[PDB]
Amino acid sequence: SHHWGYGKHNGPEHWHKDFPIAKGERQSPVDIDTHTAKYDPSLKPLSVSYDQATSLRILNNGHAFNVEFDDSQDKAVLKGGPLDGTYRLIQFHFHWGSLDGQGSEHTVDKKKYAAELHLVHWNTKYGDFGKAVQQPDGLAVLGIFLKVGSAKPGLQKVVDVLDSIKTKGKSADFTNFDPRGLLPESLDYWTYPGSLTTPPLLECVTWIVLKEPISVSSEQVLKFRKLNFNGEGEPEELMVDNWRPAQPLKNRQIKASFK
């Protein structure tokens, strides 16, 4: 049976065995070197339209936890920036560390943050997510760093339900969550063409990584670390360090929306 994770035997260094695209030309995440990621004046402002977002459920999938949204209409969309057309929010999730000093997938001048939020969107041109993931312009992932600091009020609804989804396969109803409460005030960003950061590592993502982190409390992120990778009745494996390290940039350009 096929399995993957973040452990010694099944972790990122081994993903290439079952998923040879892991050594591909457009893999994510990457380190963002601010000396070489140049301002591009042709980049437009990002348009985030989340005012009508409709969350449905929250699920522990054994790798992270996803908050899933109704993506049957343009209720929560990303437009503008480097994108053509309309990208619908389907889910968000996080990657995080075992310690406050690590957890993010993207890094900025090699700096790691405590966690990283991924808001995952698919291009409506392709009809559904399953077709979109097969296209180079299929997905747009908005990535937001989490820096340990003040508590984030808009995260607390998430933190408060995590005890109900401790183990793999558990889910809960999760309505009326406002994803606007997870955004920073500035939407200045970096963008590059990349991939899913988990198997199957498909190269279908326009990455949009925000410059400004959001602040999370030490206690809020500690709650994330109480989750389990494993199923109920299996040996405890705490859900920590579920991040893939920076991959080679290869021929790619990272463009900045800001000076």
Binding residues for Zn(2+): 93, 95, 118
Q: Residue 171's beta-bridge partner residues? A: 59
Q: In whole angstroms, how far apart are CA 28 and each of 23, 204, 209?
A: 11, 11, 12
Report the distance separating Cα 159 and Cα 169, nearest Å: 18
Report the distance separating Cα 221 and Cα 156, nearest Å: 11
Residue 20 binding: pick among Zn ion, a second copy, none (C-beta 5-8 Å cut-off by kind): a second copy
Residue 50 binding: pick among a second copy, Zn ion, none (C-beta 5-8 Å cut-off by kind): none
Residue 74 binding: pick among a second copy, Zn ion, none (C-beta 5-8 Å cut-off by kind): none
For a second copy, the binding residue among 7, 20, 85, 149 (CB under 8 A) is 20
Query: 66, 42, 68: which is closest to 53 by C-alpha?
Result: 68
From residue 68 to residue 107, the character string flagging contacts with Zn ion as x (rule: CB under 5 A) and all else as - is: ----------------------------------------
Cis ω for the linkage preceding 29 (within 30 of 0): yes
For Zn ion, the binding residue among 112, 118, 121, 152 (CB under 5 A) is 118
Residue of 9, 14, 63, 121 with catalytic role: 63
Minimum distance between the CB of residue 130 and a second copy, rounded to whole angstroms?
A: 9
Report the distance separating Cα 65 and Cα 75, nearest Å: 22
Query: 231, 252, 257, 200: which is closest to 30 by C-alpha?
Result: 252
- Whether 63 sits among the annotated catalytic residues: the reply is yes
Site for a second copy in 108-137 (CB under 8 A): 126, 131
- Interacting residues toward a second copy by CB under 8 A: 18, 20, 126, 131
Residues with a known catalytic role: 63
- Interacting residues toward Zn ion by CB under 5 A: 118
